[PDB]
Amino acid sequence: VSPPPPIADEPLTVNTGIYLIECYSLDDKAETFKVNAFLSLSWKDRRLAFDPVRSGVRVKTYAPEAIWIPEIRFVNVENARDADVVDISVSPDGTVQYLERFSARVLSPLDFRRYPFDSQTLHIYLIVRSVDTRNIVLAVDLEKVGKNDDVFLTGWDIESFTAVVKPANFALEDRLESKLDYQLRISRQYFSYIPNIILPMLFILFISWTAFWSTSYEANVTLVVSTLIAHIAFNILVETNLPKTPYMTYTGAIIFMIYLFYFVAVIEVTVQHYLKVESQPARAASITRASRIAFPVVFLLANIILAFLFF
Amino acid sequence: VSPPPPIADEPLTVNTGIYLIECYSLDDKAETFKVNAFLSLSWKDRRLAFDPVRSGVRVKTYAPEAIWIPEIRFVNVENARDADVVDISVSPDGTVQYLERFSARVLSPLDFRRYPFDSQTLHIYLIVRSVDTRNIVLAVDLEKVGKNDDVFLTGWDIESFTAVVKPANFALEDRLESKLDYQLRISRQYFSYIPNIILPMLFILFISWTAFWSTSYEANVTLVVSTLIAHIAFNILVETNLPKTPYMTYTGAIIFMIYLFYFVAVIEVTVQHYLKVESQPARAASITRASRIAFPVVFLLANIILAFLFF
Amino acid sequence: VSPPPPIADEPLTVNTGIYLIECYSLDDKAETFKVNAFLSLSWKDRRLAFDPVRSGVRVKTYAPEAIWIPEIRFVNVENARDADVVDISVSPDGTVQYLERFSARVLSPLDFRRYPFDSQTLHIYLIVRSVDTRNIVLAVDLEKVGKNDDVFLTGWDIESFTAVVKPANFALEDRLESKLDYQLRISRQYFSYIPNIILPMLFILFISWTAFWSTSYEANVTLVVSTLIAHIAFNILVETNLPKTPYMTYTGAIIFMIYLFYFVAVIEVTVQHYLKVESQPARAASITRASRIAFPVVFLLANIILAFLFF
């Protein structure tokens, strides 16, 4: 089969629409998500036109094999989409109405800078390669772009599913390609991070600061070192749920900065002891008393500065 | 092939039934379960009707290709179901009896609020898209709905497998859709959680409270900090078996609240020592004596309040 | 094609046989195992009978397509078996001899009560659905049931591979189903558990009891708390290799009971210190001296009681 012939030299417009059914498995480490939706395509093929009076019927159904169907592919998919044809319907003028149900693992990158208080724009790129007979251009039928109300992405809030109506028309391997951008705007449900990582991490830090109300070196060493290891466990736990970024993430920055607080606490604890042993507990008392105010104040200000830089 | 013709303007009723053979792999993190079942379909096609005297036979068997079969899909499945046709049998009046054995990974969300003392309703949604010739409506043939006696879902108790007999008939992409709700009611086997997580977690908490019968700061610091680290390991272990929820789970709440008890124990231990050093062991004795009653009482009441809010 | 016709009203007997070539991947958590075997089927179809004198051949080979083959399925399989036909041979009387090679992930439940000193009976269920023309019944040709000598299941000892010769006939969706039970009897190789989990776990417990020969509270607290944490690690390591059971496993019971020994050791250590501080070291000495005998004796008797209840 060959593509439909042009009336004049116009390109063939394939109207598209994606309707999300099931949306799942957003892998932060892999920067992938799995989709399960409807793909609706529509184009005019005059060769398929018929008289509704003479034929009796208002629409004609065809098998994919019977007629010409545009080879529509997804750009950022991992493997080729799994698709199953729901319907192919021709109206008297030759307007073909294709519908298929598909599933694909889509590879759209993520910006972890404000993690876990981040929002993402997932992309689904539809593309079409022009044949030698004629150039094929994509379009968005906005009435055929939507999503189910049940559509739920675990640990995420789905904000919008829209399409950038003007396609990107460009050359690739000496043939004209028409790309379309479907954007799924989502925002992370940060709630669980608070009682599971953030608050536990702050509690262990404040426990390390009880060393500023203790003269026992052996007890302080235990307090600051033990809590530093729990902080190491939280750093490891966090960096497992995330990929290696060439930039600093919000949680990454807080986690990193807290190491400096542990390091300075070890110095204070060491200084206090050296001074006490050197028979200068008065000077050690001044340093310990100051640290009680300095550590919370510097922690609170440093956090104001970080939240400011990141948001 | 085309769909059966209407005697009048009535829609075509496809009677359905799901009989679960094997139910398995309930992933709490993914909110998926795998199923292995029979899917039975029954509809009347007058074109297939025959005389049982003239033809000799009582029923006629057909290959799927020979006749029209309604396109039945599952809504909340992950990928398209794996199905294999068991039988197609036509009765003299034209009543078709389709049977297929399928497997699918079903995506039904879970409510972890009362975890691990939760009960779930897993859903299997059957759907059908109306063709242009005529509208297709689903029905439940209750005699062809069930579960095998052997059906076991590891770590769960299977309560019931029923179907909401009235379909959800609605419009989608300008065509009628008939959705059916098959509900699998299950309840978690919480027993293992008690000797593996709950009791070990309570033992480590009570061990931290032996610091209220000790004047040794060095020993108390070790007792409360060491047991706090074991509590962190239990928090990590628990949050691995579960997905990130935008709400508080029952175990999540208890685990979180227990951090506050560790934090207040560190404060008491610190106050006792400061007072002893400040040569006020009488006042430190009053606080330590009070804590011995306060901590268990507040723990017991806080737990009564939590169990009340959650159940 | 249609099934063979009955000489009288008798059902059609399909003689079966499974011969294991490779047996592997027993997942304790999933209660699955992978199998790679031959499935052999034999039934009489009089329509296929021929005179060996007139025809020239002793046996005739047919492609699956050509003749009627009974639809045999596995009940407890996860997904449909992967099968490849080795041979189809018809003798002069019409006796068909089918052979295929297959692989399947079989879902047979396990009894972890005596873990890791448990024995299991894995099941492979063959089933057949009767058609409208005639009822189909399964049989066991014992000369065609066996296993290769090389057959090895990693971490397990293969005891026997037999079949329950009388099928389990029952009605399902108003049609006769003939089920067959192939049983693979295996027993766990517990050897590794001894130097990796059991002996390390006992060593850490005995180390906690060296606190009964020490008056140093700070040292005892460290001994009992540190070893309790290593016991938590062993509990976590063990519960990862196993699924969540609604019953107590043997290792689960020992692991649980050992927590009580750690809890009572913390109490003794606390009592000894309180008494020493209260200037009653004579009474604390009596308790410590008693504990030295009590703890090993109660541990040894409690273990005799457990081994008795479980074996």
Next chain:
Amino acid sequence: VSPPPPIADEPLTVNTGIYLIECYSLDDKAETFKVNAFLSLSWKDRRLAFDPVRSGVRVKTYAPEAIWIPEIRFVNVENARDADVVDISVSPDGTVQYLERFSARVLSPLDFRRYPFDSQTLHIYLIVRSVDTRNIVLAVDLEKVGKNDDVFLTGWDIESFTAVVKPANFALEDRLESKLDYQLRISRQYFSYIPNIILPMLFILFISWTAFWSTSYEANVTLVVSTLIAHIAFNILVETNLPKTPYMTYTGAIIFMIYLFYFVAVIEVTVQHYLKVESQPARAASITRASRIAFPVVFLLANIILAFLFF
């Protein structure tokens, strides 16, 4: 199609050859390895004979479907090999030269007794089932057996890839089976084990022995218990990279024996303290002084004995 006809009662010889391209994914836990190779087959089928003077073409090419091809299977594979036909060349006498390139997950058992200083022989078993027309026997055309130079198996050294030229001809389910043995000899690259597990494990053990130059019970308890916990982590780490064996592995034995050294160190530390408290530091001094020589000497001799038994 039928198998080629004989000249006499001679069996049909299918000449074989395996040429490894890619060798990878050696799973120690699963005792599997993945292989991407060429499987070459050759047999004579006089029925395919042609005159090139008349046919124009020295050799004739065919699609697998067009002619009879022996059903050659692998014994020890997990699932059926993924194969793609490269070439089928038929010369005028009727000699078929079959080429395919496949990938398979071969299941060949491993001997971990000398781990990580072990050498393995991985097996790839080719098999063929005789048909009723005539018996089929396998052969090795040594000119078509080899491996690529680039063939690298991560963490292993590939020594040789050879075939046992004489097939194993045996009876199975009353039909001749001709099995061939292809052997891939490999030896583990033990180097990473030395700086990652062996030396770290020895360092922590020697650190525990610094307790023989310390009179501080509190410090000794910390030294021996802390280092014992690091040894538990190394035991856990090692047993994760390995399956549960019914025998003792070399690393398993060293790891196990080291527990006894920790247990005896705890006894010495306890004895020293009891004696010091009992006002017998002279006797405690004798035991501590002896331990300084005993522990390294017994460790060194025990290791000589183990290396001797294992190698």
Next chain:
Amino acid sequence: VSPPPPIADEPLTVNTGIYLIECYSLDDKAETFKVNAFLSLSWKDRRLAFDPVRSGVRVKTYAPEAIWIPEIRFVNVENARDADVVDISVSPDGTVQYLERFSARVLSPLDFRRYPFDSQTLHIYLIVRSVDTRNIVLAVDLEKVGKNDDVFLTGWDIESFTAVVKPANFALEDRLESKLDYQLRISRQYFSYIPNIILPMLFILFISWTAFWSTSYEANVTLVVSTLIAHIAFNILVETNLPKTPYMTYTGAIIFMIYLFYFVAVIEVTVQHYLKVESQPARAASITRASRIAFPVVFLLANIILAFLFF
């Protein structure tokens, strides 16, 4: 179908080109990466030639089945590539322009010597086996070799994608083979390693050195042993993200060497205590004072030596 006939004895040149659409999943442990590209093939088949005047058309499209297509395979792929034909276009002279979109898991080895400051050259090898009619040789059509701007390999910087224009022409199983080398040059984004592994690891080491400003053996033992355990946790975390190499990696060397610093710190701490107890605190003071300079200086020089050997 047969291959195109030669004008003379020249081989058939198949011009190739790979253009990467998406590049993903670089597994350091497995030494694999997944690719999704275009594969373009061009060769002349005079049998397909046509006059543009007489035929009207400028180019003729064909289905893969209609015409002869060279069997191009990838050497270092894991399983056979997933490919889907985009276009086949024949010019009047008989020049075929084939295009297919494919996905494959490519197995190219990695050099972890400078990890995580390493650069890699990933390879994609295209190969072709000569048929008996004529020899087939590969070529690089540089205008049809490239990558998309969006191409992102998580945690890596993509430097270049080029092809070694001269193929490797060699004999294999008595037929010629034409191999082509496509090289993807990438360099690791080491930035995340600094705040997550390197700086945390240095902080814990410096904390261990605060023992040189403390006379408390009990506190020093805790400082050096606790920080040694956190270093073990970093060694384990690092060796999980990497495969077992027969050479020393840069991070591996630093991690290893740091163990020696912990071991010498334990010795110093032990010597200081022995001397203090032996009533020689003056000599212990000299050693402790020296260690304060020795440890940082030796650490800094040893690191200069390592960076020199590795870079």
